[PDB]
Amino acid sequence: PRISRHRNSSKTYSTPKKPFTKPRLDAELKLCGEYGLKCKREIYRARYMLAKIRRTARNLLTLDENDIKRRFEGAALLRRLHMLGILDEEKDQLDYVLGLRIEDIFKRRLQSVIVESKLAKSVHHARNMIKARHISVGGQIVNIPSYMVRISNTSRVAIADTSS
Amino acid sequence: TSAGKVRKKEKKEKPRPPRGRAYKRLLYNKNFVDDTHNGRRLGPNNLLIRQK
Amino acid sequence: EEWHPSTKLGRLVKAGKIESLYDIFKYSLPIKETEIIDYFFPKSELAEEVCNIMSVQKQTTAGQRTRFRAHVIVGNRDGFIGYGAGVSKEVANAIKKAAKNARLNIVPVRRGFWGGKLGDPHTVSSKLSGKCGSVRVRLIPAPRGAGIVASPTVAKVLEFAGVSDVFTRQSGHSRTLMNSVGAVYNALKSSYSILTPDLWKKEQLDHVQ
Amino acid sequence: VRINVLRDALKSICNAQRIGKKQVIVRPSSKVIIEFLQLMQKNGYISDFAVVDNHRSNRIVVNLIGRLNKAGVISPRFDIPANDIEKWVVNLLPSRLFGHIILTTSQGIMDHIEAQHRQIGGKVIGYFY
Amino acid sequence: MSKTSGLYTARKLRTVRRVNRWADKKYRKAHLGTWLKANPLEGACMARGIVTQKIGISAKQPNSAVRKAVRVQLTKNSKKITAFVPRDGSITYIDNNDEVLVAGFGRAGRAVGDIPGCRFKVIKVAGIGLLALFLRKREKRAR
RNA sequence: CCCGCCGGCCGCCCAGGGAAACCGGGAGGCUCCGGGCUCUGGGGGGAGUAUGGCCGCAAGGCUGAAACUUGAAGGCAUUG
RNA sequence: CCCACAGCCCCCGCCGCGGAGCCGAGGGCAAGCUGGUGCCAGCAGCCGCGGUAAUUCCAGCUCGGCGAGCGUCGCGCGGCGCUGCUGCAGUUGAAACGCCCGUAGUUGGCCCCCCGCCGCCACGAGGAAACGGGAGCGCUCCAGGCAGGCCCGUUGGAC
Ligand SMILES: [Mg+2]
Ligand SMILES: [Mg+2]
Ligand SMILES: [Mg+2]
Ligand SMILES: [Mg+2]
Ligand SMILES: [Mg+2]
């Protein structure tokens, strides 16, 4: 057969079981306005990733502290979270993870990091600027609004040298 | 006895709204900033009367 | 005009002799005056919500006599919850009666941890069950961040009680709202009457209150 | 006919404690009953007890002090794997913090905490909290 | 207790469930085979047939109306069914001896609404969706 | 005569249980839901019918469907 | 630049087509104003609407949901503790054989300190990957792939 048959693929998001729920609609619209999200698939993606992290943390927490698997997996998970900036550096216990929330994921988006740096007037302005390729990360132009910046690259985000 | 006995006004020309993320901006402003007494509803007679 | 106490407990409340509601609850003293609680909540921290409004008819010689029945819950989102009902010929007066009854009866709610102890309790102390009519409810502690897994009606009660993480199960004819709310109320009420090994400590009775 | 002596003993104990009694008498004695009661005593639920010899069907006397809220048996002895204990704990116990689940192992009768400590499994006998 | 609970009793429990799960109407209707042999569509989403008579059916007692339907004969079975064209004034688009595509109603094989003994819907005629003809998206000038 | 024990037949009833009527020598000790064994049921009709099999002098008994149809049928209690 | 030849992606120069539909607005279930018709025409998964205001039909205005996708039909899982091992019911709602004996079958009080055997628990060997889980790596992100950096565990692909 064609080698293209062995290529993998998967979905990335989940839809709520009860759609018409007033508080949920209000909160989702509030978040969309605050962070200027395009559609409601982004929130579903964030919820999916958060659920994955929470499930991993639960499974690890069920075990004993001195379980080799627990140590290995918790160390990897904490390192990833710290490198990504989602979890604060000073927290190094698996319990703290279960308290995380999607807003922490959102705060690490490129729009957010360039807005808190005073490099853009607004999230909408940030998106428009990102599309036109006036921005760079570590000397490389990034035009994806949902691109997530690691902590080590936070000070390396600047305006594109070649942009007008 | 004739089917279709039950089956004329022209369409009013108005500027198209801003589609995409912009639609989310005005909806946010419609019911979180811009004013919508007697509590509030969505397009009851009284609210529509004032704008007319 | 001014709140004139009609009970010894009411007069004591009028004076500043007793300072906390937990003191009254510790001696299982019935409450008969709506002012005895609002004095301890001067800023109207207590919320309010009308769960259901239903109409009941009585057959008579000439037509039917209609009436309204209302259900109301109140809480400050800090280990306090109450439930009441009221019936009257008019909707507004029935709502007032239900609010008064809900305010009158109130119970503290015990909260605990799922595994790791981190400051403020976030879920129920342990498993709790309630029963009213055909309806049964189970409340199971949940981890932090799990939200409230429950139907819209029960979730409002759990919010007003000041809970954040909990798994629920319902059995019976749950479409009867009053019996569901009563079952959850009874389950919450039972919380401070369940003995645990932490409370095995033997303390001598005191001559206060 | 009589089959599960432990079930009858536990039902009698709970019945007596319900109406705030002080002593109970359970008719047939057995090694498993004795170990169950010893564990209960070490955890602080039932204080002291005595075994009365009569050559046949030895009787037992136990002294109560409240505290106990529920006790039971699982009749068919299921074989819990060492890593399958959390599900049973969640299903059976009110909370993951103070209940006890009894298992019989090649190392003897112990609690689920002790079996988790030694990372071994076995068969289930009962529970109390 | 009422149910057997011994450690060596798996066979009896399996047999009990095997026998007793045939008492559910849904399970029987699905796993028995009579419905499949009796359903004119043989477990298909929709079928293609020829209309042969255009008729009107009265409604039930609490309602009062004459619903417009046609008689169809399925190509792959040669049996007869009654299919109902709901949209207003859409009977005039259907002509006698015309090729049609007929699907089901919401419920699997029960009657829907006040229409007595009707279980099928017309969706396409002469290759054009009826919903599209009703909205004037297309025209049937080929017929 | 009265004070007990075993066994049996009954009445009222605190807890508890239940949709309730009521049970309480359990219909209790159960969503805080695991003593052992056996049988039966899964919306209402069609229908204990048709077709086969076994038994029986017969009358009939045991076993026992489907197509099709239908949105309620039922229980305990309240006011008229 | 790439490519067997050509596209495509990507990079460099000169001009520079900015386009949203599908469903719905009585309840379940988030979302209301005139004109027609008059139990007719039609809507309606269920409850129901329509016999002169039709908040439900047909139109206009307005509004809501998802969104480059939306809706309809059939099947499977879930919903369903309505197949119940966990975990249903059996006085009156559907349902304890008229009663006894009884074989297969299922279930069987207490007691021995250590030996043998069966089940049981734990560990281990042996035996394909792909899939799934999972360690590390900025295909610009991502769905993915096993890459890759210079001053690399013997660079890595562990389990
Ligand atoms: Mg049970
Ligand atoms: Mg039936
Ligand atoms: Mg049932
Ligand atoms: Mg009857
Ligand atoms: Mg019956």
Listed by start position, the domains of chain C span 2-108, 109-202
- The Cβ-side half-sphere exposure at B27, using a 13 Å CA radius, reads 18
With H, G, I as helix, E, B as strand and everything else as coil, classify residue E104: strand
Q: Which amino acid is at C200?
A: W
**In 10 A of CB E41, how many CB atoms?**
19
- D1 and D62 in one domain? yes
The tokens of E25 are what?
């109407």
Determine, yes or no, domain membership for A127.
yes
Tokens 């009749």 belong to residue: D75
How far is the C-alpha of A39 from the C-alpha of A24, rounded, in Å?
Answer: 15
CA C192-C193-C194 angle, to 5 degrees, is 100
Do chains B and D meet with 3 or more Cβ pairs nearer than 8 Å?
no
How far is the C-alpha of E88 from the C-alpha of C169, rounded, in Å?
Answer: 47
For residue D43, give the nearest of D16, D67, D23 by alpha carbon. Answer: D67
In the 190-209 stretch of chain C, whose C-beta falls under 7 Å of nucleic acid strand F? 190, 194
**Number of residues that this document lists for chain E:** 143
- Give one DSSP letter per residue of C79-127, joined into a string: SEEEEEEEEESSHHHHHHHHHHHHHHS-EE--EE-SSS--SS--EESS-
**In 10 A of CB E86, how many CB atoms?**
16
Question: Looking at the complex, does the CB of residue B4 fall below 8 Å from at least one CB of chain E?
Answer: yes
Q: Is E42 left (phi over 0), alpha (psi -120 to 50) or beta?
A: left
The tokens of B25 are what?
């901006």
**Distant-in-sequence, close-in-space partners of C54: CB < 8 Å, separation ≥ 6:** C68, C69, C70
The tokens of E51 are what?
């209309």
The tokens of A156 are what?
């390396």
Name subunits touching B (3+ CB pairs < 8 A): A, E
Task: Give A77's strand partners.
Answer: none
How far is the C-alpha of C21 from the C-alpha of E24, rounded, in Å?
Answer: 56
C176 alpha carbon – ligand 5 mean position (Å): 26
E8 CB closer than 7 A to any strand G atom: yes
CA A124-A130-A132 angle, to 5 degrees, is 110
How far is the C-alpha of A16 from the C-alpha of A27, rounded, in Å?
Answer: 14
By 3-state DSSP, what share of chain E in percent is helix, strand and coil, each rounded to 5?
20, 30, 50
With H, G, I as helix, E, B as strand and everything else as coil, classify residue C12: helix
**Distant-in-sequence, close-in-space partners of E96: CB < 8 Å, separation ≥ 6:** E51, E52, E53, E54
Tell me if D69 sits within 8 A of D100, measured CB to CB: no
For residue D86, give the nearest of D104, D72, D99 by alpha carbon. Answer: D99
Virtual torsion, Cα C11, C13, C15, C19, nearest 10 deg: 160
Positions in chain F where some atom is under 7 Å from a protein CB: 18-20, 28-43, 66-71, 79-80
Determine, yes or no, domain membership for A67.
yes
Alpha helices for E1-143 (secondary structure H):
10-20, 25-31, 34-38, 130-134
How far is the C-alpha of E86 from the C-alpha of E123, rounded, in Å?
Answer: 9
Tell me if D79 sits within 8 A of D88, measured CB to CB: no
The tokens of C79 are what?
């280990």
**Distant-in-sequence, close-in-space partners of D69: CB < 8 Å, separation ≥ 6:** C194, C195, D129
What are the φ and ψ backbone dihedral angles of D115, each rounded to 5 degrees?
Answer: -65, -40
B49 CB closer than 7 A to any strand G atom: no
How far is the C-alpha of C139 from the C-alpha of C150, rounded, in Å?
Answer: 10
Bridge-based pairing of strands E66-74 and D108-111 is unpaired
**Distant-in-sequence, close-in-space partners of B7: CB < 8 Å, separation ≥ 6:** E88, E89
The interface residues of chain E toward chain D in range 1-60, judged by CB-CB distance below 8 A, are 5-7
Q: Which amino acid is at C39?
A: Y
Give how far the C-alpha of residue D49 lies from the chain's centroid of Cα atoms, to the nearest Å.
14
- D36 and D7 in one domain? yes
The tokens of E2 are what?
């009422």
CA E94-E99-E101 angle, to 5 degrees, is 90
- D73 and D62 in one domain? no
How far is the C-alpha of C42 from the C-alpha of D81, rounded, in Å?
Answer: 57
Classify residue C64 by burial, with Cβ atoms within 10 Å: 0-12, 13-18, 19+. exposed
Count: domains in chain A = 1
Tally: H helices and E strands in chain C: 6, 10
In the 35-94 stretch of chain A, whose C-beta falls under 7 Å of nucleic acid strand G? 38-41, 52, 56, 72-73, 76-77, 79-80
For residue C150, give the nearest of C135, C138, C162, C168 by alpha carbon. Answer: C168
With H, G, I as helix, E, B as strand and everything else as coil, classify residue C11: helix
Tell me if C94 sits within 8 A of C200, measured CB to CB: no
How far is the C-alpha of C37 from the C-alpha of C44, rounded, in Å?
Answer: 10
Task: Give E57's strand partners.
Answer: E67
The tokens of C178 are what?
């009053």
**In 10 A of CB E132, how many CB atoms?**
12
Give how far the C-alpha of residue E28 lies from the chain's centroid of Cα atoms, to the nearest Å.
19
How far is the C-alpha of C89 from the C-alpha of E50, rounded, in Å?
Answer: 64
**In 10 A of CB E141, how many CB atoms?**
5
Tell me if A16 sits within 8 A of A25, measured CB to CB: no
Positions in chain G where some atom is under 7 Å from a protein CB: 12, 20, 23, 29-33, 36-37, 39-46, 48-51, 57-68, 72-76, 81-86, 88-90, 96, 105-112, 119-123, 130-132, 134-136, 138, 140-145
CA B5-B7-B12 angle, to 5 degrees, is 140
CA D100-D102-D105 angle, to 5 degrees, is 140
Count: domains in chain D = 2
Strand ordering across the sheet containing A140-141 = A140-141, A135-137, A157-159
What are the φ and ψ backbone dihedral angles of E67, each rounded to 5 degrees?
Answer: -90, 145
The tokens of C139 are what?
């409340």
The tokens of A9 are what?
């693929």
Q: Which amino acid is at B45?
A: N
For residue C116, give the nearest of A66, A52, A96 by alpha carbon. Answer: A96
Maximum CA pair distance of chain B? 55
Tell me if B27 sits within 8 A of A29, measured CB to CB: yes
Tell me if C71 sits within 8 A of C100, measured CB to CB: no
Classify residue D36 by burial, with Cβ atoms within 10 Å: 0-12, 13-18, 19+. buried
Bridge-based pairing of strands D79-80 and D122-128 is antiparallel
CA of B5 vs chain E CAs: smallest distance (Å): 9
The tokens of D17 are what?
């404690």
- D76 and D41 in one domain? no
Residue A81, domain extent: 19-164
Q: Are B24 and A124 in contact (CB < 8 Å)? A: no
Give how far the C-alpha of residue C153 lies from the chain's centroid of Cα atoms, to the nearest Å.
14
For residue C109, give the nearest of C58, C168, C158, C60 by alpha carbon. Answer: C158
Tell me if A43 sits within 8 A of A31, measured CB to CB: yes
Determine, yes or no, domain membership for A96.
yes
Q: Which amino acid is at C21?
A: L
What are the φ and ψ backbone dihedral angles of A118, each rounded to 5 degrees?
Answer: 65, 15
Alpha helices for chain C (secondary structure H):
8-14, 21-25, 35-38, 91-104, 152-160, 177-189
Secondary structure letter of residue B11 according to DSSP? P
How far is the C-alpha of C107 from the C-alpha of A67, rounded, in Å?
Answer: 43
How far is the C-alpha of E112 from the C-alpha of E83, rounded, in Å?
Answer: 12
How far is the C-alpha of B34 from the C-alpha of B31, rounded, in Å?
Answer: 6
Give me the residue spans of the domains in chain E. Answer: 1-142
Task: Give C68's strand partners.
Answer: C55, C88
Q: Long-range contacts made by residues D104-108, C-beta under 8 angstroms, separation at least 24?
A: D104/D77
Q: How far apart are the first and last CA of chain A?
A: 50
**Distant-in-sequence, close-in-space partners of C129: CB < 8 Å, separation ≥ 6:** C136, C137, C138, C139, C187, C190
How far is the C-alpha of D102 from the C-alpha of D104, rounded, in Å?
Answer: 7
Residue D128, domain extent: 69-129
Helix axes C152-160, C177-189, angle to 10 degrees: 30
With H, G, I as helix, E, B as strand and everything else as coil, classify residue A24: helix
Tokens 């008689």 belong to residue: E71
The tokens of A157 are what?
């985000």
How far is the C-alpha of E39 from the C-alpha of E79, rounded, in Å?
Answer: 11
Tell me if A126 sits within 8 A of A115, measured CB to CB: yes
With H, G, I as helix, E, B as strand and everything else as coil, classify residue D108: strand
How far is the C-alpha of C138 from the C-alpha of C131, rounded, in Å?
Answer: 10
For residue D39, give the nearest of D119, D103, D118, D94 by alpha carbon. Answer: D103
**Number of residues that this document lists for chain A:** 164
Tell me if C180 sits within 8 A of D47, measured CB to CB: no
Question: Looking at the complex, does the CB of residue A36 fall below 8 Å from at least one CB of chain B?
Answer: yes
- D98 and D45 in one domain? no
Give how far the C-alpha of residue D6 lies from the chain's centroid of Cα atoms, to the nearest Å.
8
Q: Which amino acid is at B34?
A: D
E24 CB closer than 7 A to any strand F atom: yes
Q: Which residues of C34-55 are buried (b: 16+ CB within 10 A; e: fewer)?
A: eebbebbeeeeebeeeebeeee
The tokens of E83 are what?
């299919």
Tell me if C123 sits within 8 A of C100, measured CB to CB: no
Name chain C contacts of A61, Cβ cutoff 8 Å: 115-116
How far is the C-alpha of C163 from the C-alpha of D99, rounded, in Å?
Answer: 23
Secondary structure letter of residue E43 according to DSSP? S
Tell me if C105 sits within 8 A of C83, measured CB to CB: yes
Give the C-alpha distances (Å, rounded to integers) separating A50 from A12, A95, D115. 12, 15, 33
Tokens 């988790």 belong to residue: D116
Question: Looking at the complex, does the CB of residue B42 fall below 8 Å from at least one CB of chain E?
Answer: no
